[PDB]
Design a binder for this molecule. Structure first.
Ligand code: ZN
Length: 864
């Protein structure tokens, strides 16, 4: 791959597109003011799905020279426009009229199917150019570093709204068609082609004015303007936040957020015209959830952050796309946390991007964040959950290492320097290094140019009133000690806190050595020491036995912040699974979480204990670990109770469902008895139970029920009114324990009553229900492999079916059985999932064989 010759660079695009609806085509003429930087006889542009009618170049004050040479290269999406004579150095005007297609590929200038408040089914002209689809709406230099200004014009019917990046400056009628009106927009600033936007359709709107004076609007489908009210007030507060943080005003005169029906791209940060899918921007009061207002605040703060970082200053090449999305993925939580501190959104960030990035970065076949991108198709291949989640995680670690003071100063220097220009990743490290005086380029190179993350071991010794800390770093791997003689090293900024001040740093350090000693002044032995305050650093911490015991009071009295309790517990399970520490040591810490009120912490607690419970189901003391789970969740269960208390939040309803389902599955007698009261009153029409208690009650009564209970659930499903009620049953049907009922659920998955896209959910619940239910699900998909393969081959479902079925196995002999099965019955699209699952089975197998009897003897001694 090679970029455009750059012998002719654009200056201003004058576009006028007439979307031919019903015919699904469009015609448009382009007057591109350009500069000939080097004498050439041909101009090379990007173009796809567009046939040029005629094209001529008119130099300044001269006659136009029509092009008599056309060359369409579809594999490279580039077109060469040859001319009879050399164009010579100077300024000219490239005039190109052409015709295009409103394709069905949800890319470029395509058609968007929407339904009126009555029906009829109409189509709209919606745009989407990122990454390289602007060349399908009009021929252009479709590269982010080739910036120019845009004069957008649209010839739309009178009864249809035409939006674009800028505001409307003229609305004159169309002479050839009385039913059409040409809408001309203002001139955009210097920007990239992949951020240009224009949409044609029928939309209602709600408007407001931000404190900066910027006109904010939320465009909704016809008849849903009230649903975009919340997104409007969030966007109206988001602009002043980024204005104050960047010390740079909003670069455009107006901001628009339009909700589109079935918007495939999800969300696009088009400069001034941010597009969403209505299921992610609007809040339907009779269909939305509880945390929907939280999800809207995040998606609005993310794309509006790009209006500065990404649109005002754009990446030089797609190699730096991770930094554009990683920065926005981090500052979106900073914006929501400032406007809505009642969310404690940073605890959910650690539970989302942070932990998910540490899972992938600790396994084999990982890759560094920044990878050189040659062809723009290589993007879709080498960027994944690693480049974005770990990308946002290292930015958070960098912000904490810099400090919010110098970080704001460096970003203002960065934005003002490269405004309406382009920059690379190294340009950002320089602007931050100038404002902070810290070696940012050197530190960040260890986190971007190599894969993996370090494990920080810390040991404590009391020296007078101070405490000496001995730190060492090594590459962390989910399997254990990293085998390899390269010995990776990281420059690790570490924030340390003590019990005397658990919410602010006791000491900030930078570990640029494999081993390092640290002295904390005035730290009494009765005080605990916590590394990685706020879990801001992208690393795992292994505490010594003495240091871990000192942290137990901090967990119990909640003085340790919830985000710290989340990260501490998550590190303990990973270290025990890797064989670095014992599992018994982790189980003793679980007893200190009995006072935990935070939903996110319990969510990760329940997830980790669920992995261990299903792992220990292969042993002869599965009753002992269930009794242990009941003791951990009993106090929080009694605190929440069964009915919503006066003035609860939305997380307390979610936490009640998680806790009750955990106790119900573990056999908690009081929970099982009450769940049967609610279920028998729900099926007899005496009092329908809440939708929040519905899933835990179903799981509990079905696991501890019989064939009568299963028939009731099947009657609730075949009679279920909506699809949502069906899915809530399909996930819990696998909780049955009797073998003939398990086979009945598996057969029910492939029946006509279950839709094929939901069949994997039913079989997934069977594999996760019990040990014999997992073996029955694995045998079921082997006997019916011909049908299941024909159903989901080459799709996402076949990888999800294999994942949910075999990941729970804890026998190393079983890992060799799934690898041998897919060597005789190939599944090409799921080749990567089989390798991850086989490595995961061997990991759980070694973990089980190493710690089985130690856990057993711990549970017996604890009970006495
Ligand atoms: Zn983004």
């Amino acid at each position: 791959f090679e970029r455009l010759p750059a012998d002719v660079s654009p200056i201003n695009y004058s576009l006028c597109l007439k979307p031919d609806l019903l015919d699904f085509t469009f015609e448009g003429k382009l007057e591109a003011a350009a500069q000939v930087r080097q004498a050439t006889n041909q101009i090379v542009m990007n173009c796809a799905d567009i046939d040029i009618i005629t094209a001529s170049y008119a130099p300044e004050g001269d006659e136009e020279i029509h092009a008599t040479g056309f060359n369409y290269q579809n594999e490279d999406e580039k077109v060469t426009l040859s001319f009879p004579s050399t164009l010579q150095t100077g300024t000219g005007t490239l005039k190109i009229d052409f015709v295009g297609e409103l394709n069905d590929k949800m890319k470029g200038f395509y058609r968007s199917k929407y339904t009126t408040p009555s029906g009829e089914v109409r189509y709209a002209a919606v745009t989407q150019f990122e990454a390289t689809d602007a060349r399908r709406a009009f021929p252009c230099w479709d590269e982010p570093a080739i910036k120019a200004t845009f004069d957008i014009s649209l010839v739309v019917p009178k009864d249809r709204v035409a939006l674009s990046n800028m505001n409307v400056i003229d609305r004159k009628p169309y002479p050839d068609d009385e039913n059409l009106v040409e809408v001309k927009f203002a001139r955009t600033p210097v920007m990239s082609t992949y951020l240009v936007a224009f949409v044609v359709g029928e939309y209602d709107f709600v408007e407001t004015r931000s404190k900066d004076g910027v006109c904010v609007r939320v465009y909704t489908p016809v008849g849903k303007a009230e649903q975009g009210k919340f997104a409007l007030e969030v966007a109206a507060k988001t602009l002043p936040f980024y204005k104050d943080y960047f010390n740079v005003p909003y670069p455009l005169p107006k901001i628009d957020l339009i909700a589109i029906a079935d918007f495939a791209a999800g969300a696009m940060e088009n400069w001034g015209l941010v597009t969403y899918r209505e299921t992610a921007l609007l809040i339907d009061p009779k269909n939305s959830c509880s945390s929907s207002r939280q999800w809207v605040a995040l998606v609005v703060g993310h794309e509006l952050a790009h209006q500065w970082f990404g649109n005002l200053v754009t990446m030089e090449w797609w190699t730096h796309l991770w930094l554009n999305e990683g920065f926005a993925s981090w500052i979106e939580y900073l914006c929501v946390d400032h406007c809505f501190p009642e969310y404690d959104i940073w605890t959910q960030f650690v539970s989302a991007d942070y932990t998910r990035a540490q899972e992938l970065d600790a396994l084999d076949n990982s890759h560094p964040i920044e990878v050189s991108v040659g062809h723009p198709s290589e993007v879709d291949e080498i960027f994944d959950a690693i480049s974005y989640s770990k990308g946002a995680s290292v930015i958070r670690m960098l912000h904490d290492y810099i400090g919010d003071k110098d970080f704001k100063k460096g970003m203002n220097m960065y934005l003002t320097k490269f405004q309406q220009k382009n920059a690379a990743t190294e340009d950002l490290w320089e602007s931050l290094e100038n404002a902070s005086g810290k070696p940012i380029a050197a530190v960040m190179n260890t986190w971007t140019k190599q894969m993996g993350f370090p494990l920080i071991y810390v040991e404590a010794e009391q020296v007078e009133d101070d405490r000496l800390l001995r730190l060492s770093q090594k590459k962390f791997c989910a399997g254990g000690s990293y085998v390899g003689e390269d010995c990776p090293q990281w420059m690790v900024p570490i924030t340390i806190s003590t019990s005397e001040d658990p919410n602010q740093a006791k000491l900030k350090i930078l570990m640029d050595k494999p081993e390092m000693n640290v002295v904390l002044k005035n730290v009494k032995p009765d005080q605990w020491v916590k590394l990685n305050l706020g879990t801001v650093g992208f690393y795992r911490t292994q505490y010594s036995s003495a240091m871990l015991e000192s942290l137990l009071p901090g967990i119990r009295d909640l003085s340790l912040p919830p985000v710290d309790r989340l990260g501490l517990q998550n590190d303990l399970f990973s270290l025990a699974r890797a064989g670095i520490i014992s599992t018994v040591e982790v189980l003793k810490v679980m007893e200190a979480f009995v006072n935990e009120p935070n939903y996110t912490v319990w969510s990760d607690l329940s997830c980790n204990l669920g992995i261990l419970s299903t792992l220990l189901s292969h042993t002869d003391f599965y009753e002992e670990i269930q009794e242990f789970v009941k003791d951990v969740f009993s106090p929080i269960g009694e605190r929440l109770g069964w009915d919503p208390k006066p003035g609860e939040g939305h997380l307390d309803a979610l936490l009640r469902g998680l806790v009750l389902g955990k106790l119900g599955k573990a056999g908690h007698k009081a929970t099982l008895e009450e769940a049967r009261r609610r279920f028998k009153d729900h099926v007899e029409g005496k009092q329908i139970l809440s939708a929040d208690l519905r899933s835990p009650v179903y799981l509990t009564v079905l696991k501890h029920g019989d064939g009568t209970t299963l028939d009731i659930m099947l009657k609730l499903h075949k009679q279920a009114d909506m699809q949502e009620e069906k899915n809530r049953i399909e996930r819990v049907l696998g909780a049955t324990l009797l073998p003939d009922l398990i086979q009945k659920v598996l057969t029910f998955a492939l029946s006509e009553e279950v839709r094929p896209q939901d069949t994997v959910s039913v079989i997934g619940g069977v594999a996760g229900g019990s040990k014999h239910g997992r073996k029955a699900a694995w045998k079921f998909i082997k006997d019916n492999w011909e049908e299941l393969y024909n159903r989901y081959q080459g799709g996402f479902l076949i990888s999800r079916l294999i994942k949910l079925s075999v990941e729970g196995f804890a026998v190393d002999k079983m890992a060799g059985e799934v690898k041998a099965f897919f060597e005789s019955h190939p599944a090409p699209s799921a080749e990567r999932t089989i390798q991850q699952c086989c490595e995961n089975i061997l990991l759980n197998a070694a973990w089980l064989k190493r710690d089985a009897e130690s856990i057993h003897q711990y549970l017996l001694q604890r009970k006495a």
